[model samples]
Every structure is written in structure tokens, then in C-alpha cells.
Target chain A: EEEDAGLVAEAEAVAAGWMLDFLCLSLCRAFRDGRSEDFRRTRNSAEAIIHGLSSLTACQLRTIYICQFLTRIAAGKTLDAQFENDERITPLESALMIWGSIEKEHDKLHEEIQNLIKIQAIAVCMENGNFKEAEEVFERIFGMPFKSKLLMIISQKDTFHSFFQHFSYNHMMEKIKSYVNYVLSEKSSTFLMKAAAKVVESKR
Target chain B: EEEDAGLVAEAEAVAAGWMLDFLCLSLCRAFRDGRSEDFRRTRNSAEAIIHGLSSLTACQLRTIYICQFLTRIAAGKTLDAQFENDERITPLESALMIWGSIEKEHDKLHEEIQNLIKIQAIAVCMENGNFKEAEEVFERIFGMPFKSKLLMIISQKDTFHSFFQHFSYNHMMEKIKSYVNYVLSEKSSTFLMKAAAKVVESKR
Candidate 1:
């Protein structure tokens, strides 16, 4: 007990601004891995912030609120339904706001941890078939690459075949060889290169 | 000239599979940063691949074709206009095919290099205001976080006010204190934390 107090006092001297960041990052990883002890520790860390707030600067205070807000969301699976009614920015929106705020500065480590949380939200949205919302979050993570990936995935699946076809028709056809070459290059062994070498063996 | 031949022969022994990867990654970075010598060297790397082709496996042949395809795209700004007419999958589409093919394997280094190329394609598409195509590429990069980022950026700007407002009202009210709390937490100094402690003498 005496050593614990000494440890807390030294941590207090170091400031809790980073402590809040640790709470969120640790919990985000914990939530993904489903580790109960990690959950307990993050909750434990927040208590120090509760005391730290009395002296926190403005930026420090808001960052903690953001941390605490996300901590609550990360801690639960059923919080989404409670959020469906309570309002004040769905937790994900708040997370997005924090994401953009981080973007304006330079924080690659924070960027990736936030990305993991954002991805979890997207996976949930995709499973729920809320694609627009999924895309909304996807747009934030890396801009348009997420959409490109979606098109590529859907391009292979048949259900969205018509929509995918129009994307194909938009320009692929005035040059038929282009389409054949794309299909052949992706599907052909070195056969296309070999066929190009000799032209025709009374070809099929 | 004798020394160059020895170097090429050594690299040839090392296999041009990695050599093609080096060329594209080098060229993509070169294109972004506008380095003329990198352009010269990647083109130089391609010559080695050309010589290496006769012994190439089927997979190797197609991958080099993909590399060569992207090398052309990275080499010029005018290429997009030529691509506007010539066909055989706009270089970006061919790149996307390669991107998906790589996605199926375990290659982090390749994933990032492809991401850089995809981002360039998306930037060009967005500048052209071809949002759908950009989104298509974005989707493939990370799924939906890129979209989330877009929404977050759009959320802050005033030009898309109405749409963002709808996104805002799709929720955020009903719990009035929640809304104020969010705005206050984000914009509030530590004053909110301070006021909460007192609360009794609030005439203002």
C-alpha cells in the first residue's frame, strides 16, 4: 500500500494528459482482443484522471472527456442501443471528431489506434447493412481507397453484378481487346505471352 | 560499362521478382516527389526484367505486365488522356487488380506501396471531381475508414452544410444536455469542470 501511493505520486508529477491517451489506446486494443484484465486496468487508470482534472489545462480537459467518452463506448457491446436514443453525437461521431482533430496535427500512432476503432465501427455497420454509414466512416480513414476496395470486392461477387457492370461499361468497351487482355492477364498463365509469340495454332 | 554488367548479373541472380517490386515502389515515390533520376532508374530496372522474362513463371509474367502497366502510368501526366481513349483497363484499374491480388497474400510492404499508388489515383480522380471512381479506389484500400475520414472533413466545412446538418440531425438532439455537454466538452475550457463543482451561484 505504501509503495502504491509512492508510485501514484510519481505518476501524478508526470501529468495525466498522456494518461488519458494510454487509457483509450489500451482499451481500444483490449476491446478488439477481448481481454478482461485489460478492461479492469483501463478503468483503473481513469480514476487518476478524475483527480488530475482539477488541475488540467483546457486542452487536457477536453481530451480527457473524449477519452472518457470513447472509453465508455469501447467498454460495452450493448452501448449502441442505448446510444440509439440518448443522442449528443453517436459515440462514433465523437470518435470521428477526435480522428479529424488528430489529423490536423501530426500523430501517426494515434492515427492507427483510432483507425482500429473506426474499422470496428465499419465492420459493425457493414454487418448491419448500413453501407452509407460504413462509407462515411471509410471516407475518413483513408479517403477514397476504401471505396475502391469495396468496388473491387463487389466486382467479384455476383449479387451486385449490374451495378458493377455499369462501372465496367462506363469506359471499358470501346476497346474490346482491353477487356480480353484484362481477363486474360489476370486469368491466363504465361499462355497469353506464349500465344502472342506464335499467333495461331489453328486456335480455339 | 563492365562494372554495370557485373552489377546487373548479380541482381539477376537475386531474381527480378523483387526487382519489379522495387521499380514500381521506387517509381510511385518518384512520381509523388518529382524525382527525375528515380524515373530513369525504374525504366532502367525494367530492362533487366525484360531480359529476365524468358525464364519467368506464369505468375511472374503477369506480375511484370502489371508492373509495366503501372510504370507507364507513373511515367507521365499525359497518360490519363491517352487512357481516356486507348483502353485495356485504365492503368489505375489494372493497378486495382494487382492490389486485390496482393490483398489475398501476406505482404505488408507491398500493401503500403500499392496504397501509395492508389492514393495518387484517388487524388487525381478527386481533382477531376470524379468522386465515384475515387470512392471505388478508396473502398479497396481500407474498407470504410477512408470514407469515414471524408465525412469527417466534410463535416467540418461549411459548403456541404445541409447534408452535414442532416447527418447531424439523423441524431444529436433529444438529449439536450447531451448536445450541450458535447459542445461544451469540446469547446469548453476547464471551466465546465470548474462550474460543475459549484453550480449554485449561477446567475449568468
Candidate 2:
């Protein structure tokens, strides 16, 4: 019984680590792609990562991670698309809903996995930092998973970009590049700078 | 190490059970008292429960339990207020947030304990189904701890009816009575018939 318990704990730890990595990867893809909508999807991924972490018996870890992710989501410009005043949701209420929903699904592994994806997307917001925009992004956290997922896919690689690759439609990629550059440049402001500094310091 | 692991698992299970019961009690009181707006607090307690369950390496069990709770919460009337748009939060997203938050809080047991109390306060929903109200009465889950304390100190009663006499001055008690009646009536419609028949048959 003791050995079994030890194995379970070890397995839970590994799963939690992977969940974090998955969230990070999803966020990176959202940032590189210019698909702001995709950022929302990536946010879902982040939530999923936390769920996976929870399966490993790490509630406090998951809570701190979520707060950190929320802090990050509240930090950016490109990612700020999620912070907008959705006709469907209020910022505070939306945040509460996300938290509430998480509370509901706190136990399920699959739900946690899917949710981590969204949470990761929001993590990108950590790099963006524009609290107003972050608040809007928080509202978007309440958005449907598929919508967020489609946005993530679109942000990373557009259908036209891939489909018309043989036809030399570099124009689309150029558009994506310009758009991404503009957002990144704009992100150089207040919160983004602070968030980036934190990330850099943490990594260092 | 084996002994430590056993203790941890046992501790986690006990903690999880306590959190769930506490949350249920808190949520029930909030509803009974007409404090629906503060129902979001239950998430914290729910988070603790999920976290503890996960720690026990009982992820699957936690997941199932969380899903049931989420389903109920999502379907609960209070959710309508939280969402504000009449739209329901997706089950998938809810699951993810719970998992993520729990994972984030994985290391903090004390935080988990305190948060459970907060969650209980917030777990009070809009009382969508009368079933919850009945559960509180028949099970005597409400009128517990604090409320019972209030009844004991405040009510100069030799019996139950006399105790309820103090509630005569409180308009809220009237509402509670109405709500309870509605719930009981509904429950009777579904199962009371069979129950009554069984009692009569047994008498014969």
C-alpha cells in the first residue's frame, strides 16, 4: 500500500509538470501567431494544465498558478483581446465564473487537461500587460472552448497560409508578421515591461 | 516513507470529506439566509476538496465528484446571476479551472482549510431547485454550527414550535417557510405518494 501511494504521488508530479509545459507551449504559439482569438483558446489550455496538476493532489499549487496566470493574462496588449467588454460577460463576473467552474471541475482529469489549454493561453497575457485589456481578457476566459481553440489554431498557422503556400501568398504571412510586430511593439508599454521583467528574472 | 505516505493519504481523505461537508453547510446557510449574491465563495471550499482528493492520488474519484458538483452548480439558479448573461458556463471550462486552481494550491494545506470556509459562504446559489432546500431541512444540514447557536441563544423555547416563534418577527423566516413548503410539495409530488402508500401498507 505504501509503495502504491508513493507511485501515485510520483505520477501525479510528472503529470503536473507536463501540464505546465503544455500551457507554456500553447501561450507561445498564441503570441507568435497574431490570432488574438487564439490567445483565448490558449487560455483554456492553461486552465487544463492546472486541472492536470490538481489530479496530482496539488490544490495550493494550482491556486497560486491560476492567480499568477490571471496576473499574466491581465498584463498584455495582443492578449488583451480577451479583456474586452463582451456583450455576454462582465469582467469580474467572468473571472468569478471561471473560478466557479474550475471549482466544479476540480476533480476531473480530462476536464482539467482541456482547461489547462485555455489557462496557458491566458498566461501569454502575462507578457502583454494592460490591466484594462487584461480585465477584458478575464471576461473572455468565460468564452467557449472550441472558439478559443479555433483562435489558437488560427493564431499559429492560418488555413490560407498553409493552403496557398505553393502559390506564394507570403502576403498573408506578411500581414501576420506586421500585425504581430505592431502588438509586440505596443506591448513595450507599462505592464508588459513589468511582466516580461518578472519572467526574465524568474528564468534567470 | 511508506508510513508517511499512508498518513498523508488518510489525512487527505479526511480533509477532503471535511471540506465537502463544510462547503455544503456553508452553501446551505448562505442560501437559507438569502445571501445569494455571495454564493461564489463556495468555489474556494470546492477547490480545497479537489486539492485534497488529488493529493490522495484519488484523481479519478475527485474528477467524478467535481463533475457532479459542477453540473449541479452550472445548472443551479445562482449561476444565472454569476454569468449575468443567462448563458451557462461550459462544463469543460469549469472542470479545467477547478483542476488548475487545485494544482496551483497543491502545497498549501492551511490555505486550503481557510479557503474552504470562504467557499462555503460563496457556495450559496440562487436556489434553483427546491431539492437543496429540502436536503437542508430533512437532513438538518442547515441550522448547524452558527445558526443552531443563534437559535439556542436567541430562542426562549421549550420545544421546536416555540423555538420557531422567535422567527415570527423575522420576515426572512416567512420566506424560508414558503421556500421550504414549495420544495416539500414538489418532493411529495415525486416520491411522497409511494412513501405514503408504503406506510399505509406496512400498517395493514
Candidate 3:
């Protein structure tokens, strides 16, 4: 029984090392190509490694990989289809589990994870043409005093414009007009008016 | 001649309106799909519209399109081949001209444009495995106090990890080690040490 346990430990270490190397390679490829396919592929492998590792250090290593992968997913709307299935566990769930296992203080990590989820949710909302919901979330996270908020929204005009293109011109214009009205109501600053005018003028 | 010019103005307005509508539709499709190919196609049309417009508003509208398109281009390494050529003006050049034509207070907008260019340059440098230059630019933009800088670099682990994957494990490990060393030298924070440990541990 002692011999068997020793052999098993050796095998596990070898396997963990192999998995880590494979993950490193996959992650490098994903980052090099900046492709969702590469990221998804690396993530699939990372999930397996996370499940297989018994060593706390090994798990910690894989947890970093998991966090990096999740951050990329949250940061954009790419490869969203890969994220929308039943067979695989959600990225957020996996992130929580990994952080939960090793770290004693997880609040900061948890909040960071939640923020990533919020960003992903916002991207999804925008992609689906749910602008109102997207706007609400954007406000909750990045919004601030009227001036900053207005500038922030203005800065992302292209994103909104892309989404608005799906609807009618009137719809797009109306949305901008309403947003402008909101900003005007918040603070009738000349800078705001000037910026808002440029935005509206471009649409016209 | 005056009457002909009026007729031409009416024709330009109609054409510009149609082109604007077409751009909106194209942008919507591109954003919804979240594909590089779709974005490149939209950008092609935008470039044409930018050239075709006589009206300043049309140019301004297309300027918004250009900024968004260029922003996306800067944000990732996708559609990179399209950026390298001699036959056409670069996206950055075109963006400068468009904004320069309309806005007299170009200081803020110009700075923003420069930042986008800087981001693109960093991505390119990273792709080429030029970490030194990438770090320099990154520091210029985002570097701060030791703690914040360490966190910021840690936050971008996925990006660095991806680039590191391209070379060899030894290369990757060395880079991470050096960065950790740099951070430690800057400040001896527990959080930085903890984060740095996990990053280096992953290589092992």
C-alpha cells in the first residue's frame, strides 16, 4: 500500500507538470494570435488541469490561468457562443471555485471577478441590442458626476452607433437626443452642449 | 452655374444620406457579429464614404466611424495585415485629418488619438516579442506607484503570458522573474509578493 501511494504521487506530479506545460503553450498561442478559438482551447485544457491537480501549488498555478482566461472573456464580446452552453461550467463559477479554494481573503478577488462579469454582461447586452440595460449597467459601474458620465458615454459613441445602426435612423437619432436631454438636464454646461452637438451633428 | 451647383448640392445630400444609412447598417451587422471580417468590411465602406463626402457633417459622421474602427484595430492584433500596405493611407493618418479639419480644440482629441496609436504600437511590439519597448510604452501610459504598477502589470498577465508562450518556457519564466524582481525592488508589498509568487509558480 505504501509503494502504491508513492507511485501514485510520482505519477500525479508528472501529469501536473505536463498539464502545466501544455497550458503554458496553449495560453501563449492564444495570446499571440489574439483569437477566441485559441483562448477557448486553452481554457478547456485549463479546466481539466484544475480538476486534476491535488497539489495546492498546482491548483494555484491553474487558478492564475483560469483568472487570466476569464478576464479576457469578460473584456470583450468575442467567442461569446463558446460561453453559452450547458455542457461546460460557467467561467464565473469556475473563477469563484478556484479563488475560493486557495485564498483566505477573497473579497477583493471576488469583487474583481464580479466586475469582469459585469463587463461581460454589458457587452452581451450591447450585442443583443438591449441598449437600455447596457446603459444602466455602464452607469452603475463607470458612471459618475454628470460631466464625466457624459464624456464617458460620448467616448463610446462608436459602440452605441454600431448597435444603433441595426435600428432605424430615427431610432438612433432619438436615442442620442434623449441621452443629450438627460445630460442637459443633469448639467447644462457649455462643454456638454458643445460635445453633444458634435455627436448629434455627426449623426445628421 | 449657380443653379447647377445647387443641383449638385441636393444630389450630394441625397447620396450622403444614403451612404450614412448604409454605414449604419454595416456597422450594426459588424458589431452584432463581432467578427474581424465584418468589421474590416464595414471599415472599407467607411473609408469610401469618408472620401466621397462633400458635406462636413458627412465627413464628421464618417470620422466617428473611423475613430471606432481604428479603436477596435488598436485594441487587438486582428486585421493586422490590412494595416500594412503602401497603396492606402493609414487609419491613424486619416483619423488625424478628419478630426483636424473640424475641431479647432484638437488638443484633447489629438491626445486621445495618440493614446490609441500607442496601444497599437504596444500590441505590435508584444507580437514581435519586444517586451522592453512594450513595457516602456505601458509604463508611460499606466505606470504609477509601485503597488499600483505591480497590480497593473499583474492585471495584464494574460497579455504578457500570451507573448511569453511564443518563445520558450525558460524565456517566459525569465521574463516573469525579472518583472517580479523589478516590482520587489520598487516596493516590498505582501500583495505584490503573493501575486508574483503565483505567476512564477505557474512556470514551475
Runs in model 2 deviating more than 4 A are A47-204, B1-66, B69-204
The digit string of per-residue lDDT tens for model 2 on B1-204 reads 656434423432443343343334333434444554423444433443454243444533443343344433333323333322324342222322353443233445424333332222222211223333323322222325545543343233223333324333243234333433433333332221333234444544
List candidate 3 stretches off by more than 4 Å: A1-204, B62-75, B78-124, B143-204
Candidate 1: segments with Cα more than 4 A from true spot: A1-55, A62-66, A69-93, A102-107, A114-118, A129-143, A151-204, B1-204
DockQ of each: 0.01, 0.01, 0.01
Worst 10 residues of 2 chain B by lDDT: B118-127
Clashes of 1: 42
TM-score, each model? 0.25, 0.23, 0.27
The candidate maximizing TM-score is: 3
State model 2's lDDT.
Answer: 0.38
- Write down the DockQ of candidate 2: 0.01
After aligning candidate 2 to the native by TM-score, how far in Å is the CA of B186 from where it should be?
36
Worst 10 residues of 2 chain A by lDDT: A160-169
